[PDB]
Design a protein around this ligand. Structure first.
Ligand SMILES: Cc1cc2nc3c(=O)[nH]c(=O)nc-3n(C[C@H](O)[C@H](O)[C@H](O)COP(=O)(O)O)c2cc1C
Lengths: 145, 386
């Protein structure tokens, strides 16, 4: 009777909060000081200071950090097609057809590998991928003609 | 459970560009939980994706999960944004884990999440990893220094011993968690420098989870007074065995006997009394005066003397406890808040209808046929005093 459903009073309750079971951890509490600090701030605070510590010693103003403020990338259009397993259509998530296009294809062709802009990946399933209008990646599949 | 159950915070955390797990301990049905995902996907901006957390503890939830997993299956068969599943409090057996991994929603699962608490539990997941070597498995290694569900197992020694075998599987993503509020203290586990204190060569980690430090956050539904309470709590170094409130933190056992880390400074009355009552139950009748008054101190009120108490006092006590004046249950019903107590309002009705059932000498024609009408009865309900 005492312990049942004791976790909900910590949220949206006007009652004295010294009567309530509220759940922290022991050692993590020390790291808890700032109150009503947005989630985005705390999680970034972790990432941003982890970056700085990694940057300063080993990286020392790395090309990766400089490329970011200047907008340069890893995994360009050709890689992105072969990387992300999820293919979005509207608000729905689908599996990457290239996963089933790449290997199962009888004849698979990667056109102009080292050159990014002209890069093309085609298959005997009749599915071909190329880039158009910069960031837009164009996948072209065909049935018969 | 309390924190991430709100669709608002898990969305806001994801909209900040971060991975998060929607709590399942606050959702009792497929339908009620499907509302949350719908509220999530609405607050989810384009493309953004979240995961789900489930508990192994009791059979009813595991039977509910059969409907729950098929709900997750149906959702992702419909193409739902939720990209992961988290099994908690225990590690499913191989045949149980294979099912989860191989579900119709599998691609939408994209990885499976397990939380080993013991050396044996770790070795169990390794066997789940070798089961499907091509399926990503994120192994979150927690402590008992963590919050909520507890354990007697040290943070280091477990990972110290089992790390080598964990790295023989490429599909295993090692994630250390517990007792971490900051990037600075958690940086050494990432570099692998943390194992050097124990003499073991560098032992890097792939990821880090923060449970506790995110509770005082702005978008969290934690009450203003409760946040201030979590704050003023002083923290500690490596957990100590001696029974006490330790840096505003003392362990306590749930109804099933498993320990729970709760705040014993912010609230000192519930936890310590519970330990008193627990260790004291043979002679409870003798300490009854001491025990029954302490329930009233923590606001777990018994009723005034049961016989002598007037039916009003009965019916007025339920209204007192169930109906908040500040939140205005009538005004609480209009937004359609999930905090709605409606079973409590239905509880009070069955008591009211019992009162008419108890005192009426006649055929019960006039009274019962009135209060039972929808339009009539619901209007009577929103006005408890009347
Ligand atoms: C209020 C609260 C509720 C929690 N609920 C669950 C849960 O339902 N399932 C679970 O596996 N872990 C749960 N946890 C544990 C966290 O998922 C995480 O493992 C732990 O909090 C990390 O340790 P730390 O917060 O002390 O750093 C909960 C923790 C807290 C504080």
């Amino acid at each position: 009777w005492w312990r049942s459903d004791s976790l909900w009073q910590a949220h949206d309750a006007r009652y004295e909060a010294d009567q309530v079971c509220v759940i922290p951890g022991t050692a993590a509490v020390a790291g808890i000081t700032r109150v009503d600090e947005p989630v985005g701030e705390l999680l970034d605070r972790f990432e941003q200071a982890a970056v700085d510590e990694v940057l300063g010693a080993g990286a020392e103003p790395v090309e990766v950090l400089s490329r970011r403020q200047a907008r340069r990338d890893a995994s360009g259009p050709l890689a992105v097609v072969l990387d992300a397993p999820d293919v979005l259509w509207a608000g729905r998530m689908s599996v990457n057809p290239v996963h089933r296009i790449a290997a199962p294809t009888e004849w698979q062709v990667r056109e102009g590998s080292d050159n990014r802009s002209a890069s093309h990946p085609s298959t005997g399933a009749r599915l071909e991928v190329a880039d158009d209008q910069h960031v837009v990646l164009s996948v072209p599949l065909s049935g018969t003609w | 459970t309390p924190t991430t159950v709100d669709a608002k915070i898990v969305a806001a955390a994801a909209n900040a560009g971060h991975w998060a797990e929607l709590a399942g301990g606050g959702q009792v049905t497929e339908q009620i939980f499907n509302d949350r995902i719908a509220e999530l996907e609405t607050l989810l901006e384009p493309g953004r994706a979240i995961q789900f957390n489930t508990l192994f503890l009791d059979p009813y939830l595991w039977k509910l999960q059969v409907g729950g997993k098929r709900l997750v299956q149906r959702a992702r068969q419909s193409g739902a944004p939720i990209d992961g599943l988290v099994v908690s409090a225990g590690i499913p057996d191989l045949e149980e884990a294979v099912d989860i991994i191989d579900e119709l929603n599998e691609v939408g699962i994209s990885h499976v999440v397990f939380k080993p608490g013991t050396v044996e539990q770790i070795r169990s997941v390794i066997r789940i990893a070798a089961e499907v070597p091509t399926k990503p498995v994120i192994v979150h290694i927690e402590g008992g220094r963590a919050g909520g569900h507890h354990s007697w197992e040290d943070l280091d020694d477990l990972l110290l011993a089992t790390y080598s075998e964990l790295r023989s599987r490429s599909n295993i993503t090692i994630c250390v968690g517990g007792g971490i509020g900051t990037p600075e203290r958690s940086a050494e586990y990432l570099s692998g420098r943390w194992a050097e204190v124990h003499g073991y060569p560098l032992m890097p980690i792939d990821g880090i989870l923060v449970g506790t430090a995110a509770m005082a956050t702005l978008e969290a539904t934690t009450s203003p007074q409760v946040k201030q309470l979590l704050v003023e709590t002083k923290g500690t170094e490596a957990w100590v065995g001696a029974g006490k409130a330790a840096n505003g933190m003392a362990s306590g056992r749930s109804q099933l006997g498993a320990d729970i880390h709760e705040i014993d400074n912010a609230a000192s009355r519930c936890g310590r009394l519970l330990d008193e009552v627990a260790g004291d139950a043979d002679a409870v009748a003798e300490r009854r005066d001491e025990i029954i008054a302490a329930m009233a101190q923590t606001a777990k009120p018994y009723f005034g003397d049961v016989a002598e108490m007037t039916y009003l006092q009965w019916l007025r006590r339920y209204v007192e406890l169930a109906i908040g004046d500040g939140n205005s249950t009538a005004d609480t019903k209009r937004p359609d808040s999930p905090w709605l107590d409606i079973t409590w309002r239905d509880r009070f009705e069955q008591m009211l209808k019992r009162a008419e059932a108890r005192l009426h000498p006649q055929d019960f024609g006039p009274i019962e046929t009135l209060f039972d009408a929808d339009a009539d009865g619901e209007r009577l309900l929103e006005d408890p005093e009347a």
